[PDB]
Amino acid sequence: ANIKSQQKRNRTNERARLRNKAVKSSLRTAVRAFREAAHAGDKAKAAELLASTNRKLDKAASKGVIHKNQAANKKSALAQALNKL
Amino acid sequence: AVKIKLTRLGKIRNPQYRVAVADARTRRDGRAIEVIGRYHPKEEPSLIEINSERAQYWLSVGAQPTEPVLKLLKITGDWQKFKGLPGAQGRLK
Amino acid sequence: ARYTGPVTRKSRRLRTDLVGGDQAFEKRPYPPGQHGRARIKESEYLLQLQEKQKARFTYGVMEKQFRRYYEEAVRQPGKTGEELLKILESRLDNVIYRAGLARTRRMARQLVSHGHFNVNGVHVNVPSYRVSQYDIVDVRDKSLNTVPFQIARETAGERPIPSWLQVVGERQRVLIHQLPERAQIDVPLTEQLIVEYYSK
RNA sequence: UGGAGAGUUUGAUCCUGGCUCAGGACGAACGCUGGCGGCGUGCUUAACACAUGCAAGUCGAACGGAAAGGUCUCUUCGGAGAUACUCGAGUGGCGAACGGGUGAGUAACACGUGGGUGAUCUGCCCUGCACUUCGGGAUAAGCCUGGGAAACUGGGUCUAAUACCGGAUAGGACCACGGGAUGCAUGUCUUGUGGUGGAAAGCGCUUUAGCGGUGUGGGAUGAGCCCGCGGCCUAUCAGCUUGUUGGUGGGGUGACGGCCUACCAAGGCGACGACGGGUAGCCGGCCUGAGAGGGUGUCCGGCCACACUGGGACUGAGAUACGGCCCAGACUCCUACGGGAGGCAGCAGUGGGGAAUAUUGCACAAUGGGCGCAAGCCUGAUGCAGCGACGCCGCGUGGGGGAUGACGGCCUUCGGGUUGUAAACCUCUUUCACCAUCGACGAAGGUCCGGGUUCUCUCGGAUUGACGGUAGGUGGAGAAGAAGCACCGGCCAACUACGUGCCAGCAGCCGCGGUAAUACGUAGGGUGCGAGCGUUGUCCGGAAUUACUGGGCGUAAAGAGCUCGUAGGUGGUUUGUCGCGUUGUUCGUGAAAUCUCACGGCUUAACUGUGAGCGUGCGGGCGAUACGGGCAGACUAGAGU
């Protein structure tokens, strides 16, 4: 653009979007994996993967890649999802 | 942040001023949350007044005044009686 | 702006000797002009207009200023004509006329305009200022030993002094007891026709 | 505490009834004229295209580094020496969503007013409590190079941080089971048990310089959403709606929600105007009016929408993201033809349209804002300043005398009248302009150096104002430099003469001028104004000529040809209750500014400030039930059998 800050600001925006992309790819692939676990109803791997799923979800919440309200929404969602498995 | 700033409501050749509480992200002649004083710098000593009992309320809750208001705040003495200084008394004339 | 013209002409036109003493008046009491003697049509609007012109040219007041004074007189509580006369008296050139420190209005006005006057020791040069209660009507200290200002002494007995102002001795300073109401106001003119006029 | 009428239909009349006029106002324009000051105000048309300049920046107390200044040096006599204050380029944080403009679009919870959020978010600000614990790996920048016209970009080493990643502990995540409080149902808070989980950081020091960070509870503020009421034309727009109406399970959101989705049912809106067409930003306000109303939404202020046209995401607490990004489209420019750049409805300013609206100025002096421990830097916000009589207010362009009532002019009944104390003349004083000079308040302010018990405070010293040598005071000179505009038959205030002779022409209206014009041109006089006066246009008034206040329908315009009947409007007598209308009181709100009253100050005024009304309305509580309304009844008088 024109402003000395604006070029630097965009150079930071690309960094933000890419490092954010790593995270949301991780959590999307992981919620899909949890759905694979729950749909099968193994209840052993489904029982033991929560230690990873809520772990990385709360990591995401702490780093602020997403926001704690929807974080709670999703974690309640899968909690009640296995509550009927 | 909530600011106690000096808002200009004067003429070309007279800068009358009137002190309130307002959000920082607001223009001068906008909506002030509540009016707590006035300042006319045209008489010999001054024309100064602050409410002196909502100013304490705003300073306690976190309404930080600006740099020209901080001086006037020591003058009315509310700063000293809010910070526990030995010069708590007002010092206007 | 000021009229800056003949006075007995408009005294004739208004058919009333506005100023105090005029030999140019009373010789030809009819209005001037080449048709000076014709029988004028006594219309209501005619006498109202001549009457408002009387009220203006008596005090040397201009049109929209007279307007503004009338629109605040109407707004003031009670009546309107008494207060309009009150305020047009309270103009300080009329104050000098009542104090007797002038011969005619056009130099009572200029003694103010030309800065020979402090009120509360404040240099005033606008002749439209309104005197308040208890106020002092004073002169500059350096005005002394000037020809009109010293003929102003022995000419203080031929004209009666109103009771709303007090004039004193070797310090030629007036004290305004109060704002004069109705009676001590000299009345060369009946004054309800101004009131009627501006409802048109 | 506030309301005016006149002309015009007839031979004459009285009604009805239009038309016209007398008033006021503008973001105004045009004609003539023109001194200044104060204070306001200035693209109303093309949301048409923009040359040129600035309008968003900040931190060396976060780090790697030494591009410039000065230093400790050597020493070429013009190079080396980062160690070193100082600091170019560079990494990160915050800001950039505030701030300013325009009103295109929008008839909409967009706006005004009042509420709900037990359905929500809110960086930096304040407060209460614990923690700062171990580590890792990259990368910029730099350096060596490659390609391309550039715009820009590929390759290889090398280095950090409050950048990134991995950890341990940590309740305000979750689930389940329970307590304890409250309701307004989904529900709300405080807790316990158990099982899961997620945070951080360092930077400086004259040796009591200091800046941080993180997890959270509560405030404050900003915001989001939803809803009752209100606010244009039109039926020569009557059928609109399928994610439409609802539900369930999900998804998604900060949050409820068809916001989205799978399934199921077939519902929702509308004659109280759906759907549609046209027009339009809305408002406190402004203009007018006696008010009710009518017109309008310009300065100011609040809200919304938009940013060349159209569509979309990102970061971040926060996005119509005007001076951010992605794409398409239209328009201007460079290209070496492969490719790229631009968006003034920001401050100016240019071109173009119009009847028409301005300086490519100064200062950050003040305030508001951004950043930094701070000094400090940025701020076309802001303060100002220039131009436009564009509007309001104020003030001058002399005053007192002055008859033989002078010359000249005009008329004339030829004796005179009129201009006219108006002039000549005498006499007096300089508001404004002229010259000279001093010279500001706006700054109990902003930094430095004396003293301060440290936070603080001044004894008291230097220096800092765009406005500006400006406003203002004083001295010098002499009426000396300073008036024009409109109109004169009635409305409407103001008349004679000469020139013209249905011609020129005037005019708002009805009318004038065809040989004697108070109505055309000129002169004189006069009137109303006056740095203003007139013409236009627009709006209100008069217009009780859309009538709620406040009108009418036999013959003036106006009773449907008649009846029945739908919605609607309206409804006899009486009893009891509800208290919706109505009504009383209080609380809250009805921002500020505006308007009114009283004071205060700018020399008065315009203008400003303060206190009191206004804010008519709305929400909650406590009263009432006379009238209207709902309900439960009763009567026979209306109505019907």
Ligand SMILES: [Mg+2]
């Ligand atoms: Mg930066």
Ligand SMILES: [Mg+2]
């Ligand atoms: Mg993948």
Ligand SMILES: [Mg+2]
């Ligand atoms: Mg959910």
Ligand SMILES: [Mg+2]
């Ligand atoms: Mg007839």
Ligand SMILES: [Mg+2]
């Ligand atoms: Mg006739």
Ligand SMILES: [Mg+2]
């Ligand atoms: Mg009529």
Ligand SMILES: [Mg+2]
């Ligand atoms: Mg001219």
Ligand SMILES: [Mg+2]
């Ligand atoms: Mg001015």
Ligand SMILES: [Mg+2]
């Ligand atoms: Mg540097």
Ligand SMILES: [Mg+2]
């Ligand atoms: Mg921006």
Ligand SMILES: [Mg+2]
């Ligand atoms: Mg903005």
Ligand SMILES: [Mg+2]
């Ligand atoms: Mg415009």
Ligand SMILES: [Mg+2]
């Ligand atoms: Mg390294």
Ligand SMILES: [Mg+2]
């Ligand atoms: Mg860590």
Ligand SMILES: [Mg+2]
């Ligand atoms: Mg843990």
Ligand SMILES: [Mg+2]
């Ligand atoms: Mg910091």
